[PDB]
């Protein structure tokens, strides 16, 4: 069983930079590339005493790819997989999907094609990108499109970075977010989104780090990703594979958007403070104080849930805990889904990174759920989309590239149609 991970755009590669770091520290792999079987899903053995990841960083600016090439992981990340362009698309879906995509996407596809040929038992793909930018949105969707026409039936886990409502670093990012989701509707089978303010709130409140850098951000994200790939990497008492998220978490072919959360995010002294057990983290994985997406699930109704347990955990108390939640009435389910949980248990506990601010726990919980909470977030995004669309803002840049208004109006009508589906699924 194997899965490869590709990183589109700037954001995805710092996610990967912390992600593969966590992986080699988990499998005991020095940054030169060698240890002093579980690596099979991520690492292929070149010759003898060497391991290369089934991964590609790919960007349009060369400076941050060169950072990876000349950082500490020069020998780990092998010098040809790290694809780099020449000029950035500069926060433009059209320049990232049509202008330079026609030169980069072919090189990327036949690169991963031979990566797949090196692979044997590929479970699926997983992508790390931000839809608010231009590089992650444009060619990222182009890749996704060409992956769908290449394989299609294989799973594509999209761990994208959705923008926060109030805090934002770009201006055309709602254009880029809508224009990426429009294709992500029918390209991603399973699309998991990560707001950043929610991660800010988590490190502010729980981790109590008054100065959070994007490194800590990505450390937590990688902690999420490792907690969901631990079932593949290590055997547990009850394992889950990548193919299950289509059947368990997606009720409708266009409603594939998942709330992600982690618990317990606990500082070093607070682990000394609190006695961690199953019930409180089972509760902790449900308040908006621990979500990676800024939304209030009390306003929403959960469609389905997924709960990954890592470490010292037995199934008895997690079944007792989910029983208490199901008999609680502060969090409500939809009437079309009586059994709304997908749980799993892995034996190995999550590890720590030196320099990180996390302490090791006896057990941790990773929650990925679907709700109508996203049914509200997409309307909040479509509203701010229409405020600047009403006066034709920043559309002449798309027309100067060669785009028109037709797909803008179609994306507007499709996202409106997804909203009616969100209401129809809420009732």
């Amino acid at each position: 069983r194997e899965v490869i991970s590709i990183h589109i755009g700037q954001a995805g590669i710092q996610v990967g930079n912390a992600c593969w770091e966590l992986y080699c520290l988990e499998h005991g792999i020095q940054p030169d590339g060698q240890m002093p079987d579980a690596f099979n899903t991520f690492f292929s053995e070149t010759g003898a005493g060497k391991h290369v990841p089934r991964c590609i960083f790919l960007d349009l600016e060369p400076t941050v790819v060169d950072e990876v090439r000349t950082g500490t992981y020069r020998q780990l990340f092998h010098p040809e997989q790290l694809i780099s362009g020449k000029e950035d698309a500069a926060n433009n879906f059209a320049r990232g999907h049509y202008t330079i995509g026609k030169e980069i996407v072919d090189l990327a596809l036949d690169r991963i094609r031979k990566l797949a040929d090196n692979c044997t038992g590929l479970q699926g793909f997983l992508v790390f990108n931000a839809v608010g930018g231009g590089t992650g949105s444009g060619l990222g969707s182009l890749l996704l499109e060409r992956l769908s026409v290449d394989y299609g039936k294989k799973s594509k886990l999209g761990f994208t970075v959705y923008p926060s409502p109030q805090v934002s670093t770009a201006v055309v990012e709602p254009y880029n977010s809508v224009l990426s989701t429009h294709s992500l509707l029918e390209h991603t089978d399973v699309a998991v989104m990560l707001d950043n303010e929610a991660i800010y709130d988590i490190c502010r409140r729980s981790l109590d780090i008054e100065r959070p850098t994007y490194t800590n951000l990505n450390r937590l994200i990688a902690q999420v990703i490792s907690s969901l790939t631990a079932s593949l990497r290590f055997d547990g008492a009850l394992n889950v594979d990548i193919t299950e998220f289509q059947t368990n978490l997606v009720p409708y072919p266009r409603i594939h958007f998942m709330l992600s959360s982690y618990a317990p995010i606990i500082s070093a002294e607070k682990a000394y403070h609190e006695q961690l057990s199953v019930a409180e983290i089972t509760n902790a994985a449900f308040e908006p104080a621990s979500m990676m997406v800024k939304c209030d699930p009390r306003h929403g109704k959960y469609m389905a849930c997924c709960l990954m347990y890592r470490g010292d955990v037995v199934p008895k108390d997690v079944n007792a805990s989910v029983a208490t939640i199901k008999t609680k009435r502060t969090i409500q389910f939809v009437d079309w889904c009586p059994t709304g949980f997908k749980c799993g248990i892995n034996y190995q506990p999550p590890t720590v990174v030196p320099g990180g601010d996390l302490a090791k726990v006896q057990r941790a919980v990773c929650m990925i759920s679907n709700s109508t909470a996203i049914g509200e977030i997409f309307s909040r995004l479509d509203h701010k989309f229409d405020l600047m669309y009403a006066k034709r803002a920043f559309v002449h840049w798309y027309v100067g590239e060669g785009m028109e208004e037709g797909e803008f109006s179609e994306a507007r009508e499709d996202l409106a149609a997804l909203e009616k589906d969100f209401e129809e699924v809420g009732a």
Partner: peptide
């Protein structure tokens, strides 16, 4: 405890 000692060394 080792983590706390590392905190003290960092401070």
């Amino acid at each position: 405890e080792e983590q706390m000692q590392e905190k003290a060394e960092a401070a």
